[PDB]
Amino acid sequence: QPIKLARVTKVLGRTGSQGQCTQVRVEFMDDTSRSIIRNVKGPVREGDVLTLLESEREARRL
Amino acid sequence: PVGTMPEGTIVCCLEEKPGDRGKLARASGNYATVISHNPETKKTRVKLPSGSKKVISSANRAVVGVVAGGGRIDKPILKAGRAYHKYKAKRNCWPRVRGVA
Amino acid sequence: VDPFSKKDWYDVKAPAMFNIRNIGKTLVTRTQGTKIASDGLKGRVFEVSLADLQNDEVAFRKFKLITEDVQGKNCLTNFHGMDLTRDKMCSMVKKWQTMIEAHVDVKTTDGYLLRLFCVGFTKKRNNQIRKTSYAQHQQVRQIRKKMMEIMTREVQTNDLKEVVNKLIPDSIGKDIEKACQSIYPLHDVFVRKVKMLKKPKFELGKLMELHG
Amino acid sequence: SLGPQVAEGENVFGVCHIFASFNDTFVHVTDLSGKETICRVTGGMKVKADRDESSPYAAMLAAQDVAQRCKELGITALHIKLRATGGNRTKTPGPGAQSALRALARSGMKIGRIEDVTPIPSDSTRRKGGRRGRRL
Amino acid sequence: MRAKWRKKRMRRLKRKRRKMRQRSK
Amino acid sequence: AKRTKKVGIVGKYGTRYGASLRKMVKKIEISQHAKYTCSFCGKTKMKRRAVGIWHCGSCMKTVAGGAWTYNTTSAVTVKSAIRRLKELKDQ
Amino acid sequence: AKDLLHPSPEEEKRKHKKKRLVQSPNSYFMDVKCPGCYKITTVFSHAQTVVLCVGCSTVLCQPTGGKARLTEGCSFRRKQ
Amino acid sequence: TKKRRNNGRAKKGRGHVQPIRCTNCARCVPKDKAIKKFVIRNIVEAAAVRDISEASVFDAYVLPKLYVKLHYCVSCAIHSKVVRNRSREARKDRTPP
RNA sequence: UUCGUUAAAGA
RNA sequence: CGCCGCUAGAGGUGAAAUUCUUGGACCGGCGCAAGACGGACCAGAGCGAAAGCAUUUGCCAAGAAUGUUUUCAUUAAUCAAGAACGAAAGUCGGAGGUUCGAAGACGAUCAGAUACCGUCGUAGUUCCGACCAUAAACGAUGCCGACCGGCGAUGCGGCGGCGUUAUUCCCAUGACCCGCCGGGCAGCUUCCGGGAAACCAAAGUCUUUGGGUUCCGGGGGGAGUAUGGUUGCAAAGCUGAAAC
Ligand SMILES: [Mg+2]
Ligand SMILES: [Mg+2]
Ligand SMILES: [Mg+2]
Ligand SMILES: [Mg+2]
Ligand SMILES: [Mg+2]
Ligand SMILES: [Mg+2]
Ligand SMILES: [Mg+2]
Ligand SMILES: [Mg+2]
Ligand SMILES: [Mg+2]
Ligand SMILES: [Mg+2]
Ligand SMILES: [Mg+2]
Ligand SMILES: [Mg+2]
Ligand SMILES: [Mg+2]
Ligand SMILES: [Mg+2]
Ligand SMILES: [Mg+2]
Ligand SMILES: [Mg+2]
Ligand SMILES: [Mg+2]
Ligand SMILES: [Mg+2]
Ligand SMILES: [Zn+2]
Ligand SMILES: [Zn+2]
């Protein structure tokens, strides 16, 4: 059960019923340049290292 | 014999065991359906008028076609007189009295 | 209990001259009591695609196999049918074309009888403005008769060796494409399905003849 | 146990059926024949909630359990057969398989070619809904 | 009220009055 | 003159045994009392013998027919199936 | 303002057979030289039936909807 | 008055069209009236294509597809964001890019 | 996913 | 339903439950039996008088259109009465019954459901014989004939074009490109004109009012109702008021 870390490359947009989470396609530090999209609530910039508890998900955009 | 005819052959007056000169499907307007032949263990399924699929031998015989006189129960007897003459022709099967009465 | 520790492995041997004979490995329960280990193995089948039998041919045009018997920890299989993949069959079905179908029963040289199919899609020519590309349906009936007729005199006197040697490079489809252009330029005619429905006898001698 | 193959380098193949539905997700590992089931973990075997057994999280947990059992029983490669409720229901697969393919490709389980062997009817047999069909 | 079900209830009333006529001719 | 408008041949009975039963007996009484065209002599002399038996008047060729008609539709279907299985691939 | 009284002959040819003024027939009579010995046979252009030569008994014109297609390309003339 | 000239469907020469069932609500709609589209989807999400390509047996020798006749009705398609309402001058248009 | 009804005029 | 293997859940929903499950459900592989159904090919495409019609092959007759220096010579158009078909549902017999499913029984949500949702299921939905003759049976637009703009396409024939591709090769048919003709389903623009407008190449050629003919409307309800008559096994259909 690994717990990995990831720094933000780009910011796609904001999502939620309250408009609170931010769909972030972050990147993978510990592996090669692969792509998953994560829902992050709270303020975030480009370069923020993020704590990931499960690197198996993928959020969708609209 | 049923081993000669192909499957789906509508026949009548067939035999249970080979050599009893015609037992199954002998009433008027009835037939059987021959299916499911076997190369080894010479058996043949026949669909009877009751709907049962009986496995029989492949050496017993059957006349090809249906029994003439089909539709005999289409006419209502329409009076007690024709039923009296019918049962007087057949046998004394008619003291039909209600068991409650 | 752990039944998979008790279960046995038989590897699958394809019949001769695909290119190779290795297919895979299957599980056997064991030989115990009435249930012999060769009971279900006589009835097991396989549905294996290409690019592992014909040395980098097209990935579609799958093949149906059935295990005939077992011979020294090696379960030997034999031809049972030939299909195509669902994505390739659903592809090349255009809304502005015509899909001509055919099917025919035929008996081989030996006692194997098979029902083989045929699909043919009409073709838009190069430098064509009319986007419809239909036919007068008499050419469609004529080409149904033609594609029903061609397969009869291929698979009339040809047993499993020659019909597999014809269905590997799609020589039937190329022959229909050659005899097809006089009627209409039909695009990518295939067979799409064929299955064995009559098997005469075990014939281990004919199986050894199939090997060589 | 060593398993079927000694001195690895040749892939041991198995057929992995993925039955994706709107209410559940099946992942199933069989040999190349189609009879001997190797492993079978559904969505309800991993998620207690009945409303969340169709979830991609349920599909990933079932896929990780299936991949762990397949690594313990000693197979390497999987030919994936995707299917859905295609008789009269929606022919498109559910939301679980789209992440279950990722969950199989993550933890071992080298994927061969993938085919959509879905049961498709010939000529659109009688639908469960009715004249005016499902409402609300 | 729909004209369809108005005509059907007047049809049922016609059937009821017809059965009343057949009951007391 | 058209003396009966609905009962037809069944007017020999009268008022008894129901309109639906008399209507269902009417068609088969017409079928059993109508003369049929003989397929052998070409005449229309098929006289009704007992049930199952039909008899043409000329040339005395007795035929085993239906119970109330000359040919049952099921019997024609059986005859078509028997000739089809006859000429199907020579047994 | 179209000259209906004196139209163009190309226009009168491109118009329909009966819709135009004179209603001239599009058919003709052609003289097929049969290659048997010498014979030249007159035949209608839109021939509906077969044409058999009385000398060599060969088919001259095939029955075809429209106008009759021919055999090997024997010559013919337009006589009006 | 008549809102359209086509009266919804495309039946102009014939008199009856055999109905085909809908996908969501499963309602019988004639096929010249129902929203009949053809979805072409890759079976793998575009972020998992790289994962399956790295974990594949072959070195990119298979690319499967998914072709589905999607068949909605006009009662569910407006609710499901396909055939949104337009203007009177905008109803004379063709397929969108 | 559930969420009914508000008399009559009087501009 | 018959076998083989794994195993604790498999349905179904917004959520659960009614249902099946260590007697093995669901799942995968093989086969058997049943009946319904003809997708993708299927289109502002075709045919039929409409209702309607889509797997392959054979047989039976019928027909639109076209090519007709072919035939008869006004044989024609519309139609009171009358007659033939006529979706679905329903009714009466015989056969069978896979799915769906009127009614019905439950499980849910709501103040309450007997309703929309889910599970099972009767008549029916299937075939061959008889009846009923109704629909938003719609083009909400009678039939025949003539005239009055254009454009690009499509289905079927016919015609013209040392163009291209198809056999063996000049000789004929096939597939594509350009144009014309006839009738057919249609599309776009328009100040041709109409109409209250929507809109319409017909709903135009209508106060500048007349080509031939049939059926129907006279404010809205009562009411397609009662009473008559007539048809039907029945449900019901046709004709059809008045008082207020
Ligand atoms: Mg009794
Ligand atoms: Mg008694
Ligand atoms: Mg007493
Ligand atoms: Mg409105
Ligand atoms: Mg209609
Ligand atoms: Mg109240
Ligand atoms: Mg129980
Ligand atoms: Mg099963
Ligand atoms: Mg009906
Ligand atoms: Mg009875
Ligand atoms: Mg019945
Ligand atoms: Mg219900
Ligand atoms: Mg049900
Ligand atoms: Mg009832
Ligand atoms: Mg009416
Ligand atoms: Mg009329
Ligand atoms: Mg043409
Ligand atoms: Mg030609
Ligand atoms: Zn006689
Ligand atoms: Zn819908």
What one-character-per-residue DSSP string does B5-55 give?
A: S-TTEEEESB-SSTTSS--BS-STT--EEEEEE-SSS-EEEEE-TTS-EEE
- The C1' atom of J104 and the CA atom of E18 lie apart, in whole Å, by 29
Q: CA quadruple G69, G73, G74, G79: dihedral positive or negative?
A: positive
Of chain D residues 28-67, which have a beta carbon within 7 Å of strand J?
28, 30, 33-37, 39-40, 42-45, 49-51, 53-54
Q: Which nucleotides of J are covered by protein (CB under 7 A)?
A: 4-17, 26-30, 33, 36-48, 50-58, 66-69, 87, 92-93, 96, 98-101, 116-119, 128, 139-141, 153-160, 165-167, 171-178, 180-182, 184-189, 197-200, 203, 223-227, 233, 235-237
Euclidean distance between CA atoms C85 and C193, whole angstroms: 10
Euclidean distance between CA atoms C24 and D80, whole angstroms: 15
Q: Residue H35 half-sphere exposure, CB side, CA atoms within 13 Å?
A: 20
Euclidean distance between CA atoms D123 and D126, whole angstroms: 10
Contacts within 8 Å (CB) and 24+ apart, C96-99: C96/C124, C96/C131, C96/C132, C96/C133, C97/C121, C97/C122, C97/C123, C97/C124, C97/C133, C97/C187, C98/C122, C98/C133, C98/C134, C98/C135, C98/C140
- DSSP three-state, residue H21: strand
Contact C205, C10 (CB under 8 A): no
**CB under 8 Å to D3, separation ≥6 — which residues?**
C9, D12, D73, D74
Euclidean distance between CA atoms D127 and H21, whole angstroms: 7
Q: Which nucleotide is nearest to C93 (CA to C1')?
A: J41
Contact B5, F81 (CB under 8 A): no
Euclidean distance between CA atoms C155 and E1, whole angstroms: 71
- In this complex, the answer to whether residue H31 has its CB under 7 A from any atom of chain J, a nucleic strand, is yes
Q: Give the minimum alpha-carbon distance from D36 to chain C in angstroms, rounded to a whole number.
A: 6
The H or E element spanning position C204 is helix C204-211
- DSSP three-state, residue F1: coil
- The C1' atom of J15 and the CA atom of H48 lie apart, in whole Å, by 32
Minimum-distance ligand to the CA of D35? 8
- DSSP three-state, residue D29: strand
**CB under 8 Å to C184, separation ≥6 — which residues?**
C122, C123, C135, C139, C143
Radius of gyration over alpha carbons of chain G, in Å? 17
Residue C115 β-bridge partners: C105, C195
3-state secondary structure labels for all residues of chain E = CCHHHHHHHHHHHHHHHHHHHHHCC
- In this complex, the answer to whether residue G9 has its CB under 7 A from any atom of chain J, a nucleic strand, is no
- In this complex, the answer to whether residue C128 has its CB under 7 A from any atom of chain J, a nucleic strand, is yes
**CB under 8 Å to B16, separation ≥6 — which residues?**
B23, B24, B56, B60
Beta strand pairing status for D25-30 and D37-41? antiparallel
Q: CA quadruple H75, H79, H80, H85: dihedral positive or negative?
A: positive
Tally C-beta pairs within 8 A across B and F.
63
Euclidean distance between CA atoms A20 and F91, whole angstroms: 80
Euclidean distance between CA atoms F64 and F53, whole angstroms: 5
Euclidean distance between CA atoms G62 and G76, whole angstroms: 16
- Polymer length of chain C: 212
The encoded tokens of residue D123 equal 């000529």
- In this complex, the answer to whether residue C3 has its CB under 7 A from any atom of chain J, a nucleic strand, is yes
The encoded tokens of residue F9 equal 């041949």
- The C1' atom of J244 and the CA atom of H2 lie apart, in whole Å, by 38
Q: At what angle do helices D56-73 and D97-106 cross, to 10 degrees?
A: 30
Q: Is F48 exposed, middle or buried (0-12, 13-18, 19+ CB in 10 A)?
A: middle
- Polymer length of chain D: 136
Q: CA quadruple H72, H74, H78, H83: dihedral positive or negative?
A: positive
Euclidean distance between CA atoms F27 and F2, whole angstroms: 18
Q: What is the CB neighbour count within 10 angstroms for residue H45?
A: 16
In the chain, the amino acid numbered C119 is V
The widest CA-to-CA distance across chain C, in whole angstroms, is 73
- DSSP three-state, residue C117: strand
Minimum-distance ligand to the CA of C130? 17
Q: CA quadruple D65, D70, D76, D77: dihedral positive or negative?
A: negative
Backbone φ and ψ of C65, nearest 5° = -120, 155
What is the stated resolution of the deposited model, in angstroms?
Answer: 3.5
| CA–centroid distance, residue F25 to ligand 6 (Å) | 62
Q: Residue D24 half-sphere exposure, CB side, CA atoms within 13 Å?
A: 12
Q: Residue H51 half-sphere exposure, CB side, CA atoms within 13 Å?
A: 25
User: Which candidate, C161, C171, C183, C193, places its Cα nearest to that of C79?
Assistant: C161
- In this complex, the answer to whether residue G17 has its CB under 7 A from any atom of chain J, a nucleic strand, is yes
| Contact at CB, C87 and H66, closer than 8 angstroms | yes
Tell me how many domains chain D contains: 1
Contact C25, C9 (CB under 8 A): yes
DSSP state, residue C8: E
Angle at H81 between CA H80 and CA H87, to 5 degrees: 130
Contact D27, D41 (CB under 8 A): yes
What one-character-per-residue DSSP string does D57-114 give?
A: HHHHHHHHHHHHHHHHHT--EEEEEEEE--SSS-SS--SSHHHHHHHHHHSS-EEEEE
Residues in chain G followed by a break, C to N above 2.5 angstroms: none
**CB under 8 Å to F65, separation ≥6 — which residues?**
B68, F52, F53, F54, F71
Contact B32, B48 (CB under 8 A): yes
Of chain D residues 94-113, which have a beta carbon within 7 Å of strand J?
none
| CA–centroid distance, residue D62 to ligand 7 (Å) | 26
The encoded tokens of residue B85 equal 């003459």
Contact D94, D20 (CB under 8 A): yes
Contacts within 8 Å (CB) and 24+ apart, B57-61: B57/B17, B57/B18, B58/B1, B58/B2, B58/B3, B59/B1, B59/B3, B59/B18, B60/B1, B60/B2, B60/B14, B60/B15, B60/B16, B60/B17, B60/B18, B60/B19, B61/B1, B61/B2, B61/B14, B61/B15, B61/B18, B61/B22
Residue G43 β-bridge partners: G30
The encoded tokens of residue G1 equal 């303002």
Euclidean distance between CA atoms F55 and F49, whole angstroms: 6
| Contact at CB, H66 and C59, closer than 8 angstroms | no
| Contact at CB, A34 and H48, closer than 8 angstroms | no
What one-character-per-residue DSSP string does C128-179 give?
A: ---S-----SHHHHHHHHHHHHHHHHHSSS--HHHHHHHHTTTHHHHHHHHH
Angle at A20 between CA A15 and CA A26, to 5 degrees: 65
| CA–centroid distance, residue H30 to ligand 7 (Å) | 44
Q: What is the CB neighbour count within 10 angstroms for residue A15?
A: 18
Euclidean distance between CA atoms A6 and A12, whole angstroms: 16
Contacts of C25 in chain D (CB under 8 A): 4-5, 12-13, 31-32
Q: Calculate the alpha carbon distances from A38 to A60, C14, H34 in Å.
A: 9, 48, 37
**CB under 8 Å to H68, separation ≥6 — which residues?**
D91, D92, H38, H39, H41
Euclidean distance between CA atoms F77 and F84, whole angstroms: 10
Q: What is the CB neighbour count within 10 angstroms for residue D88?
A: 15
Euclidean distance between CA atoms D4 and D128, whole angstroms: 46
Q: What is the CB neighbour count within 10 angstroms for residue A38?
A: 20
Residue nearest to nucleotide J93 (CA to C1'): F24
Q: Give the minimum alpha-carbon distance from B16 to chain F in angstroms, rounded to a whole number.
A: 22
**What is the domain-level CATH number for residue D91?**
3.30.420.80
Q: CA quadruple H37, D102, D99, C63: dihedral positive or negative?
A: positive
CB interface of H with A, residues 51-70, below 8 Å: 51
Q: Which domain holds residue D112?
A: 1-136
- DSSP three-state, residue H44: coil
The H or E element spanning position C121 is strand C113-121
Euclidean distance between CA atoms C95 and A32, whole angstroms: 43
DSSP state, residue B73: G
- In this complex, the answer to whether residue D19 has its CB under 7 A from any atom of chain J, a nucleic strand, is yes
Contact D54, D23 (CB under 8 A): yes
Euclidean distance between CA atoms D71 and D1, whole angstroms: 12
- In this complex, the answer to whether residue C6 has its CB under 7 A from any atom of chain J, a nucleic strand, is no
Contact C179, C150 (CB under 8 A): yes
Contact C196, C81 (CB under 8 A): yes
